[PDB]
């Protein structure tokens, strides 16, 4: 009944429509700040000199962009990894030119997303649940840290972090492929396997369960109405489902334990995405994808090209063109 | 060789700008997310059906009872995310629907690309950019990337065309 | 920008026609129960 204990009891209340909690005390403000700055910047920010060469890039709808091309542009290469809050600019005009909003947004968003993961632990504890949903979310979150923070740290500049835009996302991944040959990096390969496999297993599980729903409805009503929220009996027949799938492959390639199955559903995409986050995070330190350029030669010493050499030709075309006015010296070392 | 196929479609077809590819991407990533989030949820709303710390044992494939609480799961997600599933049948049908729809969509885009019916350009951007040498978007920047890829990769990747591009014709930024 | 002027009625009907169909179906569901 003490004033502070009342607040604490509202903060952690399980009766709030959205749970707040202590992580949320940090999450609500920082996500609001990021979201509001992003919406306003995407609509009306002026062009930003992302590569520090006084070559401003237009990213906002009002300066001639559409939904697909718009972006909040990374902060200037001239700033590097220096901290550029508003109060470090002579004016907002200056802060806008140099890409300040990008820094504001990504730092609030990363904080708020980190607190999002904590909030997931927290409500799990208040509800008497098991704790590890937040561990699944650590896969996406690590991935956002990679492209917004870790990769910029290793390369020396937030100007090489992922733009907050659809086409800027594509620019990022093209230039990443030329500087790192990410496709030939096994951790990207595992992320593709986590993501293709996750979609595969998503479809598999949804079709196998859907295949074995027990008749509870007529032809003239959605079968969904055969399940009622909080019924204790299962709504499908997993032994029927196991019997189909194990004959489709063979018996011991099918789960008959629901707990193992759902754990597998959780594990496979989470872990492939961990690795692909780790892939971006280690290419931040230039441990790049496999290089088989000129690996095959004939008896004389002629190069015999492989598909890796063909990849290299593409990579070269990306290398020589990107940031076309920004290099004065022959090697693009960062 | 497939990696090469991906890169071909960027330089020549600008396939990332295709809204049918984009819906495929949303389907594949949406499915992977559904997969991880549904497995995690089930595993973290398990009923205590045994005394052991390995919870796997505490399932019997023939039991009629749901092995996890749909009600606690629904409260959790309603309060974390605002909305949550309430119908296990819709849930599982949604998991079928999303990745299957996504892949069908991308198949359609590839049909278009059989004809070079690409989502290559935005006409309004090119008109402005041609008239205004200070107009630059991430859209214009990626097309220069595409142009690097085409000129640098086509002689070797299309040997039958006998392309010879002298050094002076290769598009190149400064220094590199 | 020199956009396609029909892009606007293309977009307006694209939103409007399917949305109205869902709204019609939902309101007549609610006044059944």
């Amino acid at each position: 009944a003490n004033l502070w204990e009342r607040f604490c009891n509202w903060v952690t209340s399980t009766d709030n429509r959205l749970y707040v909690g202590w992580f949320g005390v940090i999450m609500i403000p920082t996500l609001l700040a990021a979201t509001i700055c992003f919406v306003i910047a995407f609509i009306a920010a002026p062009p930003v000199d992302i590569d520090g060469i006084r070559e401003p890039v237009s990213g906002s709808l009002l300066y001639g962009n559409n939904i697909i091309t718009g972006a909040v542009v990374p902060s200037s290469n001239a700033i590097g990894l220096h901290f550029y809050p508003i109060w470090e600019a002579a004016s907002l005009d200056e802060w806008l030119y140099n890409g300040g909003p990008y820094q504001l947004i990504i730092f609030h968003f990363l904080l708020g997303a980190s607190c999002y993961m904590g909030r997931q632990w927290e409500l799990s504890y208040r509800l008497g649940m098991r704790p590890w949903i937040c561990v699944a979310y650590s896969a996406p979150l690590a991935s956002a840290f990679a492209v917004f923070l870790i990769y910029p740290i290793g390369q020396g500049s937030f100007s090489d972090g992922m733009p907050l835009g659809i086409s800027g996302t594509f620019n990022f991944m093209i230039v990443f492929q030329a500087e790192h040959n990410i496709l030939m990096h096994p951790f990207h390969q595992l992320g593709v396997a986590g993501v293709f496999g996750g979609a595969l297993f998503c479809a598999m599980h949804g079709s196998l369960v859907t295949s074995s729903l027990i008749r509870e409805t007529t032809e003239t009503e959605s079968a969904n109405y055969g399940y009622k929220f909080g019924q204790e009996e299962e709504t499908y027949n997993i032994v029927a489902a196991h019997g189909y799938f194990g004959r489709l492959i063979f018996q011991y390639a099918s789960f008959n334990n629901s707990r193992s199955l759902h754990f597998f559903l959780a594990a496979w995409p989470v872990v492939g995405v961990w690795f692909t986050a780790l892939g971006i995070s280690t290419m931040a330190f230039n441990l790049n994808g496999f290089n088989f350029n000129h690996s095959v030669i004939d008896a004389k010493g002629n190069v015999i090209n492989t598909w890796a050499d063909i990849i290299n030709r593409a990579n070269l075309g990306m290398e020589v063109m990107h940031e076309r006015n920004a290099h004065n010296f022959p090697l693009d070392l960062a | 060789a497939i990696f090469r196929f991906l890169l071909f479609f960027q330089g020549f077809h600008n396939w990332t700008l295709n809204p049918f590819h984009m819906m495929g991407v949303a389907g594949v990533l949406g499915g992977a997310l559904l997969c991880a989030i549904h497995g995690a949820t089930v595993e973290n709303t398990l009923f205590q059906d045994g005394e052991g710390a390995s919870t796997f044992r505490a399932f019997n494939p023939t039991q009629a009872e749901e092995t996890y609480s749909m009600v606690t799961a629904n409260r959790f997600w309603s309060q974390i995310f605002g909305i949550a599933f309430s119908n296990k049948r819709w849930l599982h049908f949604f998991m079928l629907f999303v990745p299957v729809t996504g892949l069908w969509m991308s198949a359609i885009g590839v049909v278009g690309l059989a004809l070079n019916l690409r989502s290559y350009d935005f006409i309004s951007q090119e008109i402005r950019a041609a008239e205004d040498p200070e107009f630059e978007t991430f859209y214009t920047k990626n097309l220069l990337l595409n142009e690097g890829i085409r000129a640098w990769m086509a002689p070797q990747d299309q040997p039958h065309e006998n392309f010879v591009f002298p050094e002076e014709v290769l598009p190149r930024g400064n220094a590199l | 920008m020199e956009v396609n002027q029909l892009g606007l009625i293309a977009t307006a009907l694209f939103v409007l026609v399917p949305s109205v169909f869902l709204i019609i179906l939902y309101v007549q569901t609610e006044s059944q129960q």
Partner: peptide, 30 residues
């Protein structure tokens, strides 16, 4: 006009978010 269209559609989705959260069909046990 194209800017207005984009922002209008965005605005409509945000409003839809609000109704789907706060004016959802409430889940009722059985």
């Amino acid at each position: 006009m194209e800017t207005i269209t984009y922002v209008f559609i965005f605005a409509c989705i945000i409003a839809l978010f609000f109704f789907a959260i706060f004016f959802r069909e409430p889940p009722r046990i059985t």
